[PDB]
């Protein structure tokens, strides 16, 4: 019988809020310093994509994958064609992991995404420690991450495996306001908007205000390009092709606060999928930004 395995969270021995706040600051200080990466966009978006890819492998049916084991450090998940380009985010976190060797890989990978969102004027995201590194045999096989060449029916059915409903799915997809698609990484080229390193509801505004047309890129893939220079993945554009997705898209495009709150809950839920938190485990941490600390 394949009963769901239980990944009990174990706080790192003798570590509290102040210990993980220093990790947040080490990540945040390096974000403002290494600001020339990828045409001065910064390492922000790739750290958000890292934390999502290390969590998106989760399977709710047998509790395999997820952010608990930090198995992205192993060669099988590291060389995922879906994870192309995430090596830049890993190398970004290597000097920080050497400075804080006590933190686990899963905790560092997920906290990197939380830090990037908050340091890019995004909402506060409650974060929790306790992820424990698991052996290499626990690394999930390739193919668990979604394809960008699909429609709304695929997006809804894929995220059901991550225990995510429609409103929660539209919220997480709003993180595509950050960064761009790299043709050498995924076969798509172009950013979604103008504010590449500022967390905003711009992803929804461009989906409704721009005149999109299906075009073919240099990688023979087809994507939706606008005359302003923005692009949308077929999975992105399906958020307005689906009527249920569309009403949530218009809701977020009209209310940035409603989008920030829904993303903060959905992103933490994504980073905590598959982890059993005991009763003696501490409450989620709300990390102060560098601006709130005067740093
Ligand atoms: C069906 C769901 C999704 C699909 C198919 C998808 C697909 C993609 C693809 C193909 C790229 C291009 C990466 C590159 O070429 O470098 C990308 C980038 C990105 N994705 Fe997604 N994604 C999905 C969901 C998400 C979620 C849930 C998040 C965050 C919570 C997210 C955040 C990002 C970010 C920040 C980037 C920018 C990466 C960079 O600038 O280096 N995406 N996505
Ligand atoms: O993001 O796949």
Q: What is the CATH number of the domain that holds 289?
A: 1.10.520.10
Nearest to 232 by CA among 206, 258, 263, 271: 206
* Annotated binding residues: 176
Is residue 146 in contact with ligand 2, taking CB distance under 6 Å?
Answer: yes
38-41 long-range Cβ contacts below 8 angstroms, 24+ apart: 38/88, 38/179, 38/180, 41/179, 41/180, 41/196, 41/197
- Other CB atoms within 10 Å distance of the CB of residue 137: 7
Distances (CA, A) of 261 to 113, 122, 201, 268: 16, 10, 12, 11
Contact residues for 146 (Cβ-Cβ < 8 A; gap 6+): 56, 154, 155, 158, 235
Q: Are residues 219 and 171 in the same domain?
A: yes
Q: Are residues 171 and 118 in the same domain?
A: no
Q: Are residues 180 and 295 in the same domain?
A: no
- Phi/psi at 35 (nearest 5 deg)? -95, 0
Alpha-carbon gap, residue 288 to 138, rounded angstroms:
34
Is residue 155 in contact with ligand 2, taking CB distance under 6 Å?
Answer: no
> Which ligand lies nearest to the CA atom of residue 159 in the structure?
1
Q: Are residues 115 and 185 in the same domain?
A: no
Is the separation of the CB atoms in 273 and 54 below 8 Å?
Answer: no
Ligand 1 binding pocket, CB closer than 6 Å: 45-46, 48-49, 52, 85, 146, 148, 155, 172-173, 175-176, 178-182, 185-186, 188, 233, 235, 267
Is the separation of the CB atoms in 148 and 156 below 8 Å?
Answer: no
- Using DSSP, state whether 92 is helix, strand or coil: helix
Nearest to 169 by CA among 242, 78, 69: 242
Is the separation of the CB atoms in 48 and 117 below 8 Å?
Answer: yes
CATH classification at residue 176: 1.10.420.10
Which structural domain, as residue segments, surrounds residue 12?
Answer: 5-145+267-295
* Annotated binding residues for heme b: 176
Nearest to 69 by CA among 126, 109, 115, 29: 109
174-178 long-range Cβ contacts below 8 angstroms, 24+ apart: 174/201, 174/203, 174/204, 174/252, 174/259, 174/263, 175/48, 175/52, 175/117, 175/199, 175/203, 175/263, 175/267, 176/203, 176/233, 176/236, 177/201, 177/202, 177/203, 178/44, 178/45, 178/48, 178/120
CA 52 to chain centre: 3
Contact residues for 231 (Cβ-Cβ < 8 A; gap 6+): 181, 188, 189, 190, 191, 192, 223, 224, 225
Is the separation of the CB atoms in 212 and 224 below 8 Å?
Answer: yes
Experimental technique, in short, is: X-ray
What residues are paired with 216 via a beta bridge?
222
Q: Are residues 164 and 57 in the same domain?
A: no
Q: Are residues 16 and 122 in the same domain?
A: yes
- Annotated catalytic sites, by residue? 53, 192
Resolution, expressed in angstroms to one decimal: 2.3
Is the separation of the CB atoms in 165 and 155 below 8 Å?
Answer: no
Is the separation of the CB atoms in 103 and 13 below 8 Å?
Answer: no
Q: Are residues 11 and 131 in the same domain?
A: yes
The closest residue, in CA terms, to atom 13 on ligand 1 is: 181
Instruction: Tokens 């994504």: give the residue.
Output: 270
DSSP E strands, the chain? 7-8, 180-181, 190-191, 212-216, 222-226, 231-232, 275-276
Q: Give the pair of three-digit tokens for residue 178.
A: 């950050």
Alpha-carbon gap, residue 60 to 5, rounded angstroms:
10
10-16 long-range Cβ contacts below 8 angstroms, 24+ apart: 10/130, 10/132, 11/129, 11/130, 11/281, 11/282, 12/102, 12/103, 12/104, 12/107, 12/129, 13/102, 15/102, 15/103, 15/129, 16/282
Q: Are residues 257 and 204 in the same domain?
A: yes
211 CA from centroid of ligand 2 (Å): 25
Q: Are residues 155 and 284 in the same domain?
A: no
Q: Are residues 23 and 141 in the same domain?
A: yes
> Into how many domains does the chain fold?
2
Q: Are residues 219 and 279 in the same domain?
A: no
Is the separation of the CB atoms in 120 and 263 below 8 Å?
Answer: no
- Other CB atoms within 10 Å distance of the CB of residue 59: 16
Alpha-carbon gap, residue 233 to 130, rounded angstroms:
35
């Amino acid at each position: 019988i394949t009963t769901p395995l239980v990944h009990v969270a174990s706080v790192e021995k003798g570590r509290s809020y102040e210990d993980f706040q220093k990790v947040y600051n080490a990540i945040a200080l390096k974000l403002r310093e290494d600001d020339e990466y990828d045409n001065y966009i910064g390492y922000g978006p790739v750290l958000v994509r890292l934390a999502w890819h290390i969590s998106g492998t989760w399977d709710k049916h047998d509790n395999t994958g997820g952010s608990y084991g930090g198995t992205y450090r192993f060669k099988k998940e590291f060389n995922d064609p879906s994870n192309a380009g995430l090596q830049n985010g890993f190398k970004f976190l290597e000097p920080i992991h050497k400075e804080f060797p006590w933190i686990s890989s899963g905790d560092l990978f997920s906290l990197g995404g939380v830090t990037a969102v908050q340091e890019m004027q995004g909402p506060k995201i409650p974060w929790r420690c306790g992820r424990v590194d698991t052996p290499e045999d626990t690394t999930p096989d390739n193919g668990r991450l979604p394809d960008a060449d699909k429609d709304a029916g695929y997006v809804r059915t894929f995220f059901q495996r991550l225990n995510m409903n429609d409103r929660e799915v539209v919220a997480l997809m709003g993180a595509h306001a950050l960064g761009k698609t790299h043709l050498k990484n995924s076969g798509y080229e172009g950013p979604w908007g103008a504010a590449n390193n500022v967390f905003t509801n711009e992803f929804y505004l461009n989906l409704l205000n721009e005149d999109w047309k299906l075009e073919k890129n240099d990688a023979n893939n087809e994507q939706w390009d606008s005359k302003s220079g923005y692009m949308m993945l077929p999975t992105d554009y399906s958020l307005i092709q689906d009527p249920k997705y569309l009403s949530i898209v218009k809701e977020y495009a009209n209310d940035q606060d409603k989008f920030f709150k829904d993303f903060s809950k959905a992103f933490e839920k994504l980073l905590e999928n598959g982890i059993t938190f005991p009763k003696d485990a501490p409450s989620p941490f709300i990390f102060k930004t560098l601006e709130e600390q005067g740093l």
